[PDB]
Amino acid sequence: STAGKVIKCKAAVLWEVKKPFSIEDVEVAPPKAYEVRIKMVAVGICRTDDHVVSGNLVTPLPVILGHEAAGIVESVGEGVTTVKPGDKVIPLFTPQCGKCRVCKNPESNYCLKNDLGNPRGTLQDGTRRFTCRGKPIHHFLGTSTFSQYTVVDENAVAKIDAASPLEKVCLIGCGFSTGYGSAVNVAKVTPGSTCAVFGLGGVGLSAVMGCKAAGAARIIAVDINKDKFAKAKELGATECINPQDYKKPIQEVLKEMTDGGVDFSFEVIGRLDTMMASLLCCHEACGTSVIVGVPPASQNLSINPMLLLTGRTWKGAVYGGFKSKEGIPKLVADFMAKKFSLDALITHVLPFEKINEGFDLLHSGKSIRTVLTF
Amino acid sequence: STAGKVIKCKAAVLWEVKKPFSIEDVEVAPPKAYEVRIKMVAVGICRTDDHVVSGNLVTPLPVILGHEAAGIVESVGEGVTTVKPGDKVIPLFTPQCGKCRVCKNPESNYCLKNDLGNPRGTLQDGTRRFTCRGKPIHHFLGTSTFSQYTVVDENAVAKIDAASPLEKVCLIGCGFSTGYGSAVNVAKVTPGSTCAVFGLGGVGLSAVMGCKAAGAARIIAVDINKDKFAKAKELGATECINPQDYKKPIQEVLKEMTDGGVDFSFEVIGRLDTMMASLLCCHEACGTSVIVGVPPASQNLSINPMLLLTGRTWKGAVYGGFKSKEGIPKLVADFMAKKFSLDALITHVLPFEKINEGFDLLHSGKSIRTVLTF
Numbered sequence: 001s002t003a004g005k006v007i008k009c010k011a012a013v014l015w016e017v018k019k020p021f022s023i024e025d026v027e028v029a030p031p032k033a034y035e036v037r038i039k040m041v042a043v044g045i046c047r048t049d050d051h052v053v054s055g056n057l058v059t060p061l062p063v064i065l066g067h068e069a070a071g072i073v074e075s076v077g078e079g080v081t082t083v084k085p086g087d088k089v090i091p092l093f094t095p096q097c098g099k100c101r102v103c104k105n106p107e108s109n110y111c112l113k114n115d116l117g118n119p120r121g122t123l124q125d126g127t128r129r130f131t132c133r134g135k136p137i138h139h140f141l142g143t144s145t146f147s148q149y150t151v152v153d154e155n156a157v158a159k160i161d162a163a164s165p166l167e168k169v170c171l172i173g174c175g176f177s178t179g180y181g182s183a184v185n186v187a188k189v190t191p192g193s194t195c196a197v198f199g200l201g202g203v204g205l206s207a208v209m210g211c212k213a214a215g216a217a218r219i220i221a222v223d224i225n226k227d228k229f230a231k232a233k234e235l236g237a238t239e240c241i242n243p244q245d246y247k248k249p250i251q252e253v254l255k256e257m258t259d260g261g262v263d264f265s266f267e268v269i270g271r272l273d274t275m276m277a278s279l280l281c282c283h284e285a286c287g288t289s290v291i292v293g294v295p296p297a298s299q300n301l302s303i304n305p306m307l308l309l310t311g312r313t314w315k316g317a318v319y320g321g322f323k324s325k326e327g328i329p330k331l332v333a334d335f336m337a338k339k340f341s342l343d344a345l346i347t348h349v350l351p352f353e354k355i356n357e358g359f360d361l362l363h364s365g366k367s368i369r370t371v372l373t374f
Numbered sequence: 375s376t377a378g379k380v381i382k383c384k385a386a387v388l389w390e391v392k393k394p395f396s397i398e399d400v401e402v403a404p405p406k407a408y409e410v411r412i413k414m415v416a417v418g419i420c421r422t423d424d425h426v427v428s429g430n431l432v433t434p435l436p437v438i439l440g441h442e443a444a445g446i447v448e449s450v451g452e453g454v455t456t457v458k459p460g461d462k463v464i465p466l467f468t469p470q471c472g473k474c475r476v477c478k479n480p481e482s483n484y485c486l487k488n489d490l491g492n493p494r495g496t497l498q499d500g501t502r503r504f505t506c507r508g509k510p511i512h513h514f515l516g517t518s519t520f521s522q523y524t525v526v527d528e529n530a531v532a533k534i535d536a537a538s539p540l541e542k543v544c545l546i547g548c549g550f551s552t553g554y555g556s557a558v559n560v561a562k563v564t565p566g567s568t569c570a571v572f573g574l575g576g577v578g579l580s581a582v583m584g585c586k587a588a589g590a591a592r593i594i595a596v597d598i599n600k601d602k603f604a605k606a607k608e609l610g611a612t613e614c615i616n617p618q619d620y621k622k623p624i625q626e627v628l629k630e631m632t633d634g635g636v637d638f639s640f641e642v643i644g645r646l647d648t649m650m651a652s653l654l655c656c657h658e659a660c661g662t663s664v665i666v667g668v669p670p671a672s673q674n675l676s677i678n679p680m681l682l683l684t685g686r687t688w689k690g691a692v693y694g695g696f697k698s699k700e701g702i703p704k705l706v707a708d709f710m711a712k713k714f715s716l717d718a719l720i721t722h723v724l725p726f727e728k729i730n731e732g733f734d735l736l737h738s739g740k741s742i743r744t745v746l747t748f
């Protein structure tokens with residue numbers, strides 16, 4: 001078929017920050033050893049991809065973004081053992097190399113092969129694999145799934161049940177794993193808990209579902225766009241509060257209604273002020289706050305150490321604490337076992353060519369998740 | 375009798391900022407409903423008392439300070455079931471009321487009857503018990519043990535072993551418990567780990583001891599006053615490193631030396647600089663940083679969220695996370711079972727009358743603990 005030689009296909013290239021997508025012809029080069037070329041079926045538009053086109057994330061340009069996705073293996077490099085041609089996979093946006101200090105810790109998931117800390121714009125081997133009009137293109141977060149084909153490494157590709165719906169199970173690459181793992185795994189939510197979840201988009205609604213899942217007493221979701229409330233209610237929310245109806249700031253309104261702080265506070269928006277509301281609204285001698293939202297580049301918060309001395313614990317994490325290559329297999333098997341549902345979150349399915357339109361529904365706020373089909 | 379009514383004795387009166395403490399004559403009105411009037415026998419000087427004098431801790435003046443002590447029950451106020459007269463007893467700078475949210479909740483020890491957070495200088499009910507020169511005097515942290523006699527509340531005092539050598543055992547009243555529990559109880563130092571302790575005065579050295587009791591493998595004790603290292607070492611430190619011998623900042627100094635970050639970092643000092651230094655030296659994808667030192671009056675840190683999004687967990691604590699009425703007798707029981715030695719922390723024993731000399735000894739770096747015997 002194509003394996004061995006190069007494939008020429010399309011992609012939605014980002015050339016300039018604050019500039020639209022260019023769906024172009026590109027040349028995706030052969031899988032090297034311990035790497036794999038995938039053929040996409042469906043990709044999801046996540047707000048982390050919208051942080052690079054607006055300058056909040058700094059990454060080398062030109063670049064082809066994307067990371068919540070699903071596809072089928074077209075070829076394997078030498079000694080690739082885990083997957084084989086024909087197989088179904090979900091590309092992981094943080095790998096599980098198997099050998100590093102982080103990886104060895106049962107409790108850590110930010111493997112030392114990730115491109116989040118300081119972006120290289122390559123694949124672990126040192127190079128790139130894309131060329132457009134002769135100009136090579138950079139790889140986003142290792143995955144680069146906004147293209148009709150992709151080469152990712154063997155330790156960052158997770159195989160899934162060959163009976164999975166690729167057009168639904170794709171949010172398990174970031175959207176769900178992240179939010180759900182924040183509640184379930186990271187914050188260690190207790191049956192009885194009172195949680196406050198700031199932000200009602202596809203990664204936060206999975207934290208609402210996760211809080212419910214763990215046995216929360218009250219789940220207070222916070223947002224500015226009120227059409228978000230309904231869906232959240234429907235997934236596990238006890239009450240929904242839009243901070244615009246208040247005279248006192250929302251950390252006060254949320255404190256008074258829970259007896260001076262919620263048990264767990266989550267911030268799934270990603271902005272410097274709400275990261276403080278989410279610290280101030282938990283209970284001062286027993287709260288916990290999990291930062292989930294990736295913030296604006298180079299900008300700092302100011303906090304007085306007395307806010308933590310009494311006991312609030314502040315933390316955060318990437319991929320909901322789930323070990324990419326070992327955990328996503330499982331999480332897909334739980335989708336399949338009919339244990340939870342991704343259908344609530346996917347609100348529109350546009351073909352790949354409308355990638356920018358999806359980005360406009362994300363910006364106006366009509367989408368929980370827009371899924372792109374190849 | 376001693377008991378019955380108002381006692382007239384000597385006390386350590388702080389009438390103004392940065393003043394020497396006068397030893398004047400005060401009157402100690404008898405314990406009301408559910409109160410205790412203890413006679414002091416041994417008190418320890420702790421830098422938190424000192425934080426008031428220097429203005430780091432605004433607390434209302436005139437005042438009697440001291441919260442680290444032992445003595446014997448004298449007159450007990452009507453309704454007390456907890457302790458009776460003659461019991462060798464230790465006061466507690468954080469109450470364990472039993473009934474409040476924090477008290478009910480299995481992890482928090484910050485009882486609401488505290489003037490720790492927000493001060494008031496009285497005993498719980500709102501009134502004060504000492505008068506000097508027809509002027510009424512405030513209390514410090516509901517204890518005020520720098521005095522021959524004091525009136526505590528019932529939910530704030532602990533019953534200990536009638537064999538306990540007051541003079542040494544008094545240290546569990548702040549210094550030991552805080553540092554110990556900071557490792558053993560809240561950082562949760564897992565076995566075969568690497569810990570860093572910044573600061574080597576009474577409480578800090580108990581934090582060194584606690585990390586060893588938990589079973590960590592490398593203990594790095596960072597402190598500028600070299601002299602302390604001899605004790606530190608002998609007590610449980612692996613390598614205590616002094617900050618001035620370096621060219622490079624102590625965070626990265628420790629980062630390289632530990633494969634990018636120590637596992638548990640504690641700051642048992644109070645310098646804002648050091649609270650930051652300690653966060654940055656713990657491992658980005660699973661580091662832990664407990665604040666233990668009391669920051670001076672409203673000097674706020676500036677930090678960027680990315681230090682937490684990868685996995686660091688920042689948090690704080692009072693009383694080793696030990697619930698007061700409970701943990702301190704248990705801990706003293708282990709001390710009576712020869713579990714630790716408080717001899718190694720006590721470096722001077724002054725006659726009470728010398729209160730002023732002991733503060734100087736603190737300020738010099740000659741002392742670890744100084745016991746002012748009554």
Ligand SMILES: NC(=O)c1ccc[n+]([C@@H]2O[C@H](COP(=O)([O-])OP(=O)(O)OC[C@H]3O[C@@H](n4cnc5c(N)ncnc54)[C@H](O)[C@@H]3O)[C@@H](O)[C@H]2O)c1
Nearest residue numbers: 047199200201202203204223268269270292293294318319
């Ligand atoms: N931790 C991770 O591993 C990880 C992975 C992916 C994404 N993320 C982060 O999650 C963030 C959220 O992503 P998303 O997928 O949910 O997209 P999203 O854009 O749909 O969600 C944002 C929500 O915030 C709401 N909002 C806006 N202003 C608000 C305000 N001032 N107060 C409260 N709510 C407000 C918006 O209306 C929307 O409901 C992303 O920015 C990204 O940084 C984190």
Ligand SMILES: NC(=O)c1ccc[n+]([C@@H]2O[C@H](COP(=O)([O-])OP(=O)(O)OC[C@H]3O[C@@H](n4cnc5c(N)ncnc54)[C@H](O)[C@@H]3O)[C@@H](O)[C@H]2O)c1
Nearest residue numbers: 421422552573574575576577598643644667668691692693
């Ligand atoms: N949370 C609580 O329960 C609790 C209880 C008691 C005390 N505290 C606080 O803990 C702190 C310690 O008490 P202590 O009696 O042991 O005081 P201490 O003065 O004896 O300890 C200070 C140590 O820090 C060292 N040091 C000073 N500046 C330094 C710097 N810039 N870098 C590194 N080391 C430096 C000093 O050399 C000394 O070794 C005080 O701030 C006190 O207010 C908290």
Ligand SMILES: [Zn+2]
Nearest residue numbers: 097100103111
């Ligand atoms: Zn790894």
Ligand SMILES: [Zn+2]
Nearest residue numbers: 046048068174
């Ligand atoms: Zn994403």
Ligand SMILES: [Zn+2]
Nearest residue numbers: 420422548549
């Ligand atoms: Zn103290």
Ligand SMILES: [Zn+2]
Nearest residue numbers: 471474477485
């Ligand atoms: Zn209480």
